[PDB]
């Protein structure tokens, strides 16, 4: 079934003793080596709950958005997931007024679409300097909006890869009544988050596996078979 253990070799570890007591429900023993260790039963239960909710929202057949701003490995990873799973994405700093307001950026997305259709029509209908300037404008617009172009209504569900650095996004999500799941690193506020995933995310060795698992969970909506959680082959990891 699900919730395999052996392959998931690195799932713990966190910055030097900055944990908050609100995560003490997940730290049963006492650790002497300036780190943390979770319990496998709780994280398997959280993974099952997350799988249930993502399959529910896949049966909803709505729209999903991913966000990410920390270390570029997660950025390129979620880019891959975006080109493995048809979903909007953001590769730069999260923009305020994105989920607490729609028109403010819907007009901008419509302007980007206008530029796209202009480029589709225009092949030799512009001068040299203006052509390069408009290409640069397209690049600047897609720097924040390139992934997020398939949304025509307020999104039904997103995820959070890091509750700490993107506290703005989780706060805006909590302002609205729509939910969101978060890869909850320890010391984060659990009251803001509605579905908690207690696993390491600061390190990439766990973030890649978690991202792949959630992509496989959401990939069933397309009648496109899953990749991991049932394959005995180990995942890849390369850093230097």
């Amino acid at each position: 079934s699900l919730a395999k253990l052996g392959e998931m070799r690195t799932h713990v570890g966190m910055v030097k003793r900055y944990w908050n007591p609100k995560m003490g429900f997940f730290i049963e023993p006492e650790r002497k080596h300036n780190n943390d260790h979770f319990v496998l039963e709780l994280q398997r239960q959280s993974l099952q709950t997350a799988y249930n909710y993502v399959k529910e929202v896949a049966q909803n057949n709505g729209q999903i958005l991913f966000v990410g701003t920390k270390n570029d490995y997660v950025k390129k990873l979620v880019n891959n997931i975006a080109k493995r799973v048809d979903v909007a994405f953001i590769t730069q700093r999260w923009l305020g007024g994105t989920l607490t307001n729609f028109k403010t950026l819907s007009i901008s997305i419509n302007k980007l679409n206008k530029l796209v259709e202009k480029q589709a029509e225009n092949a030799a209908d512009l001068t040299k300097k203006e052509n390069l300037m408009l290409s640069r404008e397209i690049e600047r617009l897609e720097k924040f909006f390139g992934g997020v172009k398939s949304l025509k209504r307020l999104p039904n569900l997103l995820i959070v890869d890091d509750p700490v650095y993107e506290k703005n996004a989780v706060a805006e999500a909590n302002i609205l009544r729509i939910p969101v799941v978060a890869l909850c690193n320890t010391n984060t506020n659990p009251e803001l988050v509605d579905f908690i995933i207690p696993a390491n995310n600061h390190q990439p060795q766990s973030t890649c596996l978690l991202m792949n698992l959630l992509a496989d969970a959401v990939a069933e909506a397309k009648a496109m078979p899953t990749m991991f959680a049932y394959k005995p082959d180990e995942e890849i990891q390369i850093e230097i």
Partner: peptide
């Protein structure tokens, strides 16, 4: 509310 379906 877990029952949007």
């Amino acid at each position: 509310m877990g029952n949007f379906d």
